[PDB]
Amino acid sequence: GKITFYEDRGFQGRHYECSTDHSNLQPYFSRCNSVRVDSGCWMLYEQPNFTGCQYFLRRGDYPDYQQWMGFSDSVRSCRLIPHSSSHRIRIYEREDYRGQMVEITDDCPHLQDRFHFSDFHSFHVMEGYWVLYEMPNYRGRQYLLRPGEYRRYHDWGAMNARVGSLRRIMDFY
């Protein structure tokens, strides 16, 4: 993976070339107003130690933070998402894997209109890496879901339970 951060929009000003996870990007730049993703899928985080708002980026040019649905120009830590050869998640109606459940291996641009239930409060990621989104069609607040268990929204770093869509992370081309 290779990603480059730029302090000013349109790929200007101080920049930093990165090919690894970083828990603290503050030594290399103080703001991030544009990004070039040479390769790989990335989760960027507004605050150090993979905290605060999260944003999914993949190969391509992002001349403004709005292009990664940024809340601001803050980017202070990052993860390079490893490859997933398959994706499998269980979606549950209530917290702690209770209520109705559905298991999917594809993307879901609208949770509400698609299943036999209309409420979504816990997830079990069996395979692969996903991005959970606040709103349908992959908009709003973004949350990385890694292989593992998410009993309630606190587990995926949300301030509340609002969810709308689910996308597998895979490299473009």
UniProtKB/Swiss-Prot annotation:
Q: Which GO terms describe its biological process?
A: lens development in camera-type eye; visual perception
Gene3D superfamilies from the entry?
Crystallins
Query: Tissue range of expression?
Result: Detected in the superior olivary complex and fibers of the ventral aoustic stria of the auditory hindbrain.
| One Pfam family it belongs to | Crystall
Which InterPro entries does the UniProt entry name for this protein? Beta/Gamma-Crystallin, Beta/gamma_crystallin, G_crystallin-like
Q: Which UniProt keywords apply?
A: Eye lens protein, Repeat
What the entry lists under SUPFAM superfamilies is as follows:
gamma-Crystallin-like
Residue ranges annotated for the Beta/gamma crystallin 'Greek key' domain, each copy included: 1-39, 40-82, 87-127, 128-170
Q: Where is the signal peptide?
A: none
Q: Does the keyword Repeat apply?
A: yes
Region annotation (Connecting peptide) maps to 83-86
| GO MF term set | structural constituent of eye lens
Q: Which PANTHER family does the record match to this protein? A: BETA/GAMMA CRYSTALLIN, GAMMA-CRYSTALLIN E-RELATED
Q: What else is known?
A: There are six different gamma crystallins identified in rat lens.
Its biological purpose is as follows: Crystallins are the dominant structural components of the vertebrate eye lens.
Q: Belongs to which family? A: Belongs to the beta/gamma-crystallin family.
Question: Domain text from the record?
Answer: Has a two-domain beta-structure, folded into four very similar Greek key motifs.
Protein name (Swiss-Prot/TrEMBL): Gamma-crystallin E
